[PDB]
Design a protein around this nucleic acid. Structure first.
Lengths: 92, 205, 203, 93
RNA sequence: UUGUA
RNA sequence: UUGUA
């Protein structure tokens, strides 16, 4: 079970993100992996998240995007090669 | 008139360092030292595992400088035909950074017969944000738990000394212009040493 | 149980430096400063010339760093949206390096209404009267034209910076410079590595 | 009025190179412009060099080889884009 | 070949 | 993407 989170600052961190979901109250995070410029390791502004529950996935899908991380709305979509492209189009 | 003695400077402001000819240093062999990991994917797996029991990897490397033709050369270990590393390795948990490099250097170049290393300069820090090759001289904003941290120490040599080398490794003296803007050749770290050493004031004995 | 007291570490081994939020620092405009040299072939002509009577040109630059989002930022000077230089300049023959820098800095970033510098971070020498600069003197060169020397300028908790009209004072985060010589020159872009050794504090 | 000088080590300074020249009777040196990698600044083994006197040129040609700068015999030659093509091919060593 | 408001 | 002895 996995997702895509995006539209967050390049200083939005795995740690202080987990706090966000912990606020919705999930705690399911298995692992998170940010996408970033290899050139300088700078975050692109979106991460592939890993989760273990399905009901929470709903909550994330459902509710997260109506919250502010650093002034941003977590554009959460599921893992798909056609979503991804918009997330990097974002970079540009 | 009589010469005035330019006093020593604050070390932070001027670091003078002594370099001796490659000749002053003699190098014999020793039973070969195959690395702990093996394949590329092999060592990352090990990393993942370990990070969970111990945590972030602590690596230390020593930059031994000699010179030739009034031009500093860094001793680089070399496996096979195109891989170089700095003498150094993984610290055991809790280990004092320096004590650990000493243990490692001795492990990796020790003379059969109790030598001593002079390490009192950290010359660089490199971090691996995730579990892949990417390393940067800094910790990115988003990263809160780096997978591996590498600390670099200039290692001063004495006027002369003898070293031993694993029968598998070859030992080369890379001159700086051989390394500079040569990331493809030696990687980022090694290839930026000319920069990271430029700050030192070298003496060619 | 009883802990022993941590021994002191030589500054050469762990240099601890204090950083502050970029927002503690602000600029005001000032009388614009042009350059001793104008066109490209000028500086070199002057260089060649000057060297002949002055000898080698000694140049310095100061590396004022700020911090935001746990990321060291370097203060650079821009004009056209493509040129960024460090604060500093040429020394006057016989001039002390550090005092020298102080002078040029205040000269270029004043407080009509101070500078702390205890670290040398780099050195680059210009082998001929051409563009190329290298962080070392190649073996066939015995007398190099210019000698740049870079320092870490520690900053006060907060301050004001007068800024010649013709300049915008930007604050590059490290990753912006990293591996980015086509953007910021070989000196500037290698500041990250050059800075990695410092144990920064983000106040 | 210039020559090329090659089979020089990468550590042949401009100073020691000139040390040899005056030591041939030639006291009218010009430029002594070294060729060198622009990436690392390493000497390219050879250096353009001009001369006011135009017979001293012969001097070099004849006398400089059979002299040893850092245990290598120089190679005084006239200037030529074929020598260029020559030295350059050597740099790859 | 970070350069010309 | 300095990595396979």
């Amino acid at each position: 079970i996995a997702l895509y989170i995006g539209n967050l600052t390049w200083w939005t961190t795995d740690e202080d993100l987990t706090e966000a979901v912990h606020s919705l109250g999930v705690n399911d995070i298995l692992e998170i992996k940010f996408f970033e410029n290899r050139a300088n390791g700078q975050s692109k502004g979106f991460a592939l998240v890993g989760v273990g529950s399905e009901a929470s996935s709903k909550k994330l899908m459902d509710l997260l995007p109506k919250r502010e991380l650093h002034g941003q709305n977590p554009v959460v979509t599921p893992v798909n090669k056609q979503f991804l492209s918009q997330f990097e189009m974002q970079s540009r | 008139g009589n010469k005035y003695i330019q006093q020593t400077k604050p070390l932070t402001l001027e670091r003078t360092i002594n370099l001796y000819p490659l000749t002053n240093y003699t190098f014999g062999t020793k039973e070969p030292l195959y690395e702990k990991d093996s394949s590329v994917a092999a060592r990352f797996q090990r990393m993942r595992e370990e990070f969970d029991k111990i945590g972030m990897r602590r690596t230390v490397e020593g930059v031994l400088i000699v010179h030739e033709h009034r031009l500093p050369h860094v001793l680089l270990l070399q496996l096979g035909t195109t891989f170089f590393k700095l003498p150094g390795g993984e610290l055991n948990p809790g280990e004092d950074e320096v004590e650990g490099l000493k243990r490692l250097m001795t492990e990796i170049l020790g003379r059969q017969d109790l030598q001593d290393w002079v390490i009192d300069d950290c010359i660089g820090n490199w971090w691996r944000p995730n579990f892949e090759p990417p390393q940067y001289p800094y910790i990115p904003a988003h990263i809160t738990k780096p997978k591996e941290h590498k600390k670099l120490f200039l290692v001063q040599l004495q006027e002369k000394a003898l070293f031993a080398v694993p029968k598998n490794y070859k030992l080369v003296a890379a001159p700086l212009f051989e390394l500079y803007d040569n990331a493809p050749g030696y990687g980022p770290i090694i290839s930026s040493l000319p920069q990271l050493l430029s700050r030192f004031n070298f003496i060619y004995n």
